[PDB]
Design a protein around this ligand. Sequence first.
Ligand SMILES: Nc1ncnc2c1ncn2[C@@H]1O[C@H](COP(=O)(O)OP(=O)(O)OP(=O)(O)O)[C@@H](O)[C@H]1O
Ligand SMILES: Nc1ncnc2c1ncn2[C@@H]1O[C@H](COP(=O)(O)OP(=O)(O)OP(=O)(O)O)[C@@H](O)[C@H]1O
Ligand SMILES: Nc1ncnc2c1ncn2[C@@H]1O[C@H](COP(=O)(O)OC(=O)[C@@H](N)CS)[C@@H](O)[C@H]1O
Ligand SMILES: Nc1ncnc2c1ncn2[C@@H]1O[C@H](COP(=O)(O)OC(=O)[C@@H](N)CS)[C@@H](O)[C@H]1O
Ligand code: NA
Ligand code: NA
Ligand code: NA
Ligand code: NA
Ligand SMILES: [Zn+2]
Ligand SMILES: [Zn+2]
Lengths: 429, 430
Amino acid sequence: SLPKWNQPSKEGKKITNLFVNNSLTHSKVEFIPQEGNKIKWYACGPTVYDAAHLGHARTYVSFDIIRRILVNYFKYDVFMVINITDIDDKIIKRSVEEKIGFTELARKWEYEFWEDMKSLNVLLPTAITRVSEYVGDIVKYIEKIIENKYAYVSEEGSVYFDIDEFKKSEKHFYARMEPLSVKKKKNAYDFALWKSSKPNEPHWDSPWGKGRPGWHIECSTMASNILGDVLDIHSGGIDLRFPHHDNELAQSEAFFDHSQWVNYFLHSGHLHIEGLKMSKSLKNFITIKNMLTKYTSNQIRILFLLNKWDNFMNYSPNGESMVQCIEIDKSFTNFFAIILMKIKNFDLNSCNLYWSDADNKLNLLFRQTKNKIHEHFLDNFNTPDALLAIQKLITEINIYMDKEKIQIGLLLEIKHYINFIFDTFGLIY
Amino acid sequence: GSLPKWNQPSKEGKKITNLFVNNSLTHSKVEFIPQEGNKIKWYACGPTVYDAAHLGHARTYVSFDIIRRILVNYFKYDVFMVINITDIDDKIIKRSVEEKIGFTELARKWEYEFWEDMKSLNVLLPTAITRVSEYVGDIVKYIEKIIENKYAYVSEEGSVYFDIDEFKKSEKHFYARMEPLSVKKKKNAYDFALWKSSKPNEPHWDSPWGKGRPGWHIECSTMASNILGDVLDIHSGGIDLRFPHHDNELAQSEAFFDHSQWVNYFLHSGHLHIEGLKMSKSLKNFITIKNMLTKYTSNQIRILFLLNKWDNFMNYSPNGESMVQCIEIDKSFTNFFAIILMKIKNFDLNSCNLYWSDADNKLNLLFRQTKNKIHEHFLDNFNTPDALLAIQKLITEINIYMDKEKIQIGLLLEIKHYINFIFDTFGLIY
Ligand SMILES: Nc1ncnc2c1ncn2[C@@H]1O[C@H](COP(=O)(O)OP(=O)(O)OP(=O)(O)O)[C@@H](O)[C@H]1O
Ligand SMILES: Nc1ncnc2c1ncn2[C@@H]1O[C@H](COP(=O)(O)OP(=O)(O)OP(=O)(O)O)[C@@H](O)[C@H]1O
Ligand SMILES: Nc1ncnc2c1ncn2[C@@H]1O[C@H](COP(=O)(O)OC(=O)[C@@H](N)CS)[C@@H](O)[C@H]1O
Ligand SMILES: Nc1ncnc2c1ncn2[C@@H]1O[C@H](COP(=O)(O)OC(=O)[C@@H](N)CS)[C@@H](O)[C@H]1O
Ligand code: NA
Ligand code: NA
Ligand code: NA
Ligand code: NA
Ligand SMILES: [Zn+2]
Ligand SMILES: [Zn+2]
């Protein structure tokens, strides 16, 4: 009566002792690749009908940080896919208001989305999967689910997922992550894999008649096509956990007829503003472009670094939440300025390089800081505490650079390490 | 009994990568295991600063720079690295009476040029730099402790010699761990000086035994022990230093701490030969680093060294012969970056199709396989020749993909970032 989860076997895998908050277990569990040091990761992308806002930025920056930690810090081999939802009721409706076709609208806002991602130093994924380019694959995916007896066709030409049949199977559980969130149909909870189109909507041909993919089947199809029958990581905002992500699991399990399509399901917390999710529906949003006319990429990334990725956060506007981010960015800038000049201007001809007690104390604190930050990253990508550890080290390096005769090589190694961590954070100085 | 023992560090609580390194203490490739956590305490013997550095010096310090970058940037070990400057030596004293600019000033001049040459070759400064002239007092105290442990004696002239026979007698000590077969004021001829009584008009320093100078080997034992302590993860130098210099350091340091293993992994770079012989100031066959840099770039010189396994000897053919291949490779890397950056720059997300095709999948498979190949090469005693070849092969395929196939912008960027990461690890700059 309660879903089971299979931790992957550790034999032959890269083992870091990283723990992650897995929505499949509702707990922090050890992260173990399916294969070697490889990580196959699908992340749900945007619905491209309008500009991206600060809440979208929080989710993609947070997962960009996690990806950089996984790749640059831990040296996992990450194969990442992000989709573009360029077929959607929202796109269709917006396109009839603006009197532009659905494709030209979608391409415009996909373009702006990637521009906004680049402006925030978010890395592009390995693969970008647009629904409009995968419709034929979605149809074949739906055919096999029907052939496995987990979907049925209405008289209208729609196709619905058969929840009751899926639950009946001993090897399958419906709504693994939110069990308690559960006319032409068998049961009301059945959701559409193929929607029969009205003759005026955009549509595609299929064995069941002209229609469009249902929302959830788009992501099962695209992720399965590129990454296969086992994903190491699937991610998205917490709102997507049910029904979207639980429905993807059911569809993909039905397609492959196995019991675990995703090993680790990661959900970022929402960015709130004045207590409510930043949302286009609520008219309380700040576009990324507007945000970047007031704050820098570094400052916005520091905002997200200060908040644990899987917890919700509140944004206080009119600069309130950004005061601290600006101060921290200012301290990193001034730290780098001094250390870079001291390295550049150091004169090996005239210096004394005896290793003093002050050099030894700074070095001990340096190595201890590396160990603290390692433990923070292993603790479910705890960037708030890793950022604080860096701040504390900088406070001491600043004292040292002002007062002590300086060990040029120690300062250079410290600079390289802090740069390495800032690269992992996505900060550019 | 008659053969030295080596103790592999325990694996419990350590970073374990399955890296194997060629350990001169075992004369074999053995798994590298940190003494503590993921830390590596590493001392590398530095230059004797009386003249310009030459290409053979460059090979040793670039090779250890590559190894350090692999350990830190690739494997994420925490490396605490010390390199010394031998600025007190008989060569420096003799050179300074010829040059007449003063002994300290001459040594400092050629130390400065050594660091300039290292800077020109993109070699990273170590964590700590230990000059003998700044450590003489600590050296005197180190010698005092060895005498107090009965492993050194004082001659009537005021020199101090290490007592080999007393040292070997101890069951816990073995003399010449790495080259066992290489073995008037003295007890035995094989005794070596820890303190040399100064002759008139030479530079000298005070000591309890009279004015003198350190012996060569005690400088490195003292400086390494002072900063890094009683167990070094790695000690390194050119192969010529293995005996007598490095074996004597082990004996001195074991005598100081009265234990049996001061160094866990002793690594020796192979010599650069030219026309069949070690490039050597004595043979008049050397090329200075500066001369080399008026003809070739940092990248090309580092590629020369990446193409040769660090612990094997290599042959340098001059007049550009050995550099032809290095120039070709460097040009192909420059051209690769030029092309891929233009393809990325010219890519239009509006007008493209991004379906993940068979060609995209085949390139991705090749990419991931290249990562695993390069990983096994680095684990195989830092095999940069095979890792460089893997990158070359991958680039050949990326070039084909960019010319004809519709390109996955994200895949091209990710591959460029990986190649940048490996090139950062090699010390190449594009
Ligand atoms: N940077 C990397 N690139 C590629 N693969 C990596 C990397 N780091 C680690 N790995 C993979 O991590 C795994 C390490 O696991 P571990 O060394 O504990 O296994 P093992 O039991 O010794 O077996 P084996 O090494 O033979 O798979 C290896 O499969 C190796 O392929
Ligand atoms: N990148 C790193 N930075 C800092 N410390 C590291 C790093 N990688 C490994 N370590 C250190 O390696 C030691 C062991 O880590 P490892 O992942 O090998 O776990 P383990 O073998 O299960 O050991 P244990 O749980 O007993 O520490 C720890 O002390 C950890 O601090
Ligand atoms: N206030 C907020 N705070 C933090 N994250 C937020 C957020 N508001 C939205 N997000 C996150 O932004 C991503 C794109 O949301 P879309 O609605 O554009 O698209 C879709 O949901 C489909 N195209 C997926 S296939 C999702 O992971 C969402 O949970
Ligand atoms: N042809 C050649 N090829 C490759 N490496 C070479 C080389 N010729 C020399 N080397 C290496 O260069 C380094 C500095 O040599 P020095 O003589 O300057 O100093 C000393 O020996 C002491 N100051 C050490 S405390 C050593 O590691 C040496 O083995
Ligand atoms: Na069931
Ligand atoms: Na929800
Ligand atoms: Na003995
Ligand atoms: Na020798
Ligand atoms: Zn999705
Ligand atoms: Zn030495």
